[PDB]
């Protein structure tokens, strides 16, 4: 026969190889294809769908819908903090289990802007202004509205808009950040502050709630497929 | 300037995953193994598939077969290389009941013979569903009266794999384990679904025990 020489890697079974193999059912006639709605071609399409963020992830709220409710009320002071969490979409509990966070945990590196949407769910009679800020790392988390407003921020008026869409820009020294927590690739902090106050008429509940949504923007990408740490097993399922 | 190639459905699913493994020993007439084919006995591939409601793909099958010497009392055990047979029995076909069964003639059933020490056996399988797509979830019953079996198990009629030692037993028993690996190729997916949050409990249904939506932190401002 033709002279050949076998190289290293012969007879190996690499789980990510791409080779042809003989068919066990020659000339099998497959069922005709049928148009089904909702075809998906890339996991980024799933990652780009807004999902409700459990910002209130206290131990007493994770087993109910209170985890998604951000309290807000009329205060007697100024510049109080509403919430604050690190921008760790793949490692922080706040964003870990959303659609974006679940897609991220199948990968090792990520890059791109993050779309944050806040919808005010109080009465139509309520008014108020909020300061939503993103602080790049290097310093700590901002501790007051003065520190928060020195970075990227927007002013949200619930009286004018029931939904504010804040797109957190990608500001990093590297092209990609690790999905797991790593200080070398810290992404910063997201905080919200009272710009003026919640103001309501008589016979209106002063305590209201805000819902936060998260999704990837158009420039988002992931790399280095891996097994997720969210599913595990001890024996085969019978 | 950043490509999304590695987040394609193909790249996401076109990786070989163990779906089951079975064992059989050469010391009895019942020394064969069987497995009803399904993708719901392993957590990882099941979760990856259940990100979608309907799927359509070809399948690459790879088997990793290893053997271990069992205790024996004969002096000087010297066994030749072992040959294995794996036979696929579509539903309705006769099934083996012993190692020396006539059904192993595999005149029409597809079968593969493989000897230890070589590369793992591998074959390709087309899309063999009676429907237009595989179903990961089925909110319905098998009986028109809405009694009896409920769920995805109604649609599982994919057949059974049978495995045995071809060689006749020698002076010492040999126990073999066959690991089955599935690799979907040419994948088409529809109706994305929320990723499974609660841990799996059973193979044939979606039963779960309630679990919190996320892990917790001390307060709403904790960083």
């Amino acid at each position: 026969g033709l002279p050949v020489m076998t190289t290293p890697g012969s007879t190996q079974f690499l789980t990510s190889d791409d080779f042809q193999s003989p068919s066990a059912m020659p000339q099998f006639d497959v069922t005709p294809e049928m148009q089904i709605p909702g075809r998906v071609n890339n996991l980024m399409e799933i990652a780009e769908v807004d999902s409700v963020v459990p910002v209130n992830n206290t131990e007493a709220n994770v087993n109910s819908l209170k985890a998604y409710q951000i309290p807000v009320q009329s205060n007697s002071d100024n510049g109080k903090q509403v919430f604050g969490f690190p921008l760790q979409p793949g490692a922080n509990g706040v964003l870990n289990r959303t659609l974006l966070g679940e897609i991220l945990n199948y990968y090792t590196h990520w890059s791109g802007s993050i779309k944050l949407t806040f919808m005010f769910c109080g009465s139509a009679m309520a008014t108020g202004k909020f300061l939503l800020a993103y602080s790049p790392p290097g310093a700590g988390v901002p501790k007051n509205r003065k520190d928060a407003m020195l970075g990227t921020h927007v002013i949200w008026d619930v009286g004018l808009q029931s939904s504010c869409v804040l797109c957190v820009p990608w500001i990093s020294q590297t092209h990609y950040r690790y999905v797991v927590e790593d200080e070398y690739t810290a992404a910063g902090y997201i905080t919200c502050w009272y710009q003026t106050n919640i103001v309501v008429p008589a016979d209106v509940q002063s305590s209201c709630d805000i819902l936060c949504f998260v999704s990837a923007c158009n420039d988002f990408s992931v790399r280095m497929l891996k097994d997720t740490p969210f599913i595990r097993q001890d024996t085969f399922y019978q | 300037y950043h490509s999304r190639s590695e987040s394609s459905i193909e790249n996401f699913l076109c990786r070989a995953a163990c779906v089951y493994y079975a064992t059989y020993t050469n010391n009895s007439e019942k020394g064969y193994a069987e497995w009803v084919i399904n993708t719901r006995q392993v957590a990882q591939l099941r979760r990856k598939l259940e990100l979608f409601t309907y799927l359509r793909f070809d399948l690459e099958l790879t088997f990793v077969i290893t053997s271990a010497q069992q205790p024996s009392t004969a002096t000087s055990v010297d066994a030749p290389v072992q040959t294995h047979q794996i036979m696929y029995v579509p539903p309705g076909g006769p099934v083996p009941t012993k190692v020396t069964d006539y059904a192993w003639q595999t005149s029409t059933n597809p079968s593969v013979f493989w000897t230890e020490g070589n590369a793992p056996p591998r074959m390709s399988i087309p899309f063999i569903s009676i429907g237009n797509a595989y179903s990961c979830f089925y909110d319905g019953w098998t009986q028109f009266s809405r009694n009896g079996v409920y769920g995805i198990n109604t649609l599982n009629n994919m057949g059974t794999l049978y495995m045995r030692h071809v060689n006749e037993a020698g002076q010492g028993p040999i126990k073999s384990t066959v690991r089955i690996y599935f690799k979907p190729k040419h994948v088409k997916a529809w109706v994305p679904r929320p990723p499974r949050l609660c841990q799996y409990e059973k193979q044939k249904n979606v039963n779960f025990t309630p679990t919190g939506v996320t892990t917790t932190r001390v307060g709403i401002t904790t960083t």
Binding site: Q20, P22, S23 | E10, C14, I125, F127, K185
Partner: peptide
């Protein structure tokens, strides 16, 4: 080689990449 199908069945082909 670069790309040649060795089998008569489409299921035998490598992945779509």
């Amino acid at each position: 080689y670069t790309n040649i199908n060795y089998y008569k069945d489409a299921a035998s082909n490598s992945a779509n990449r």
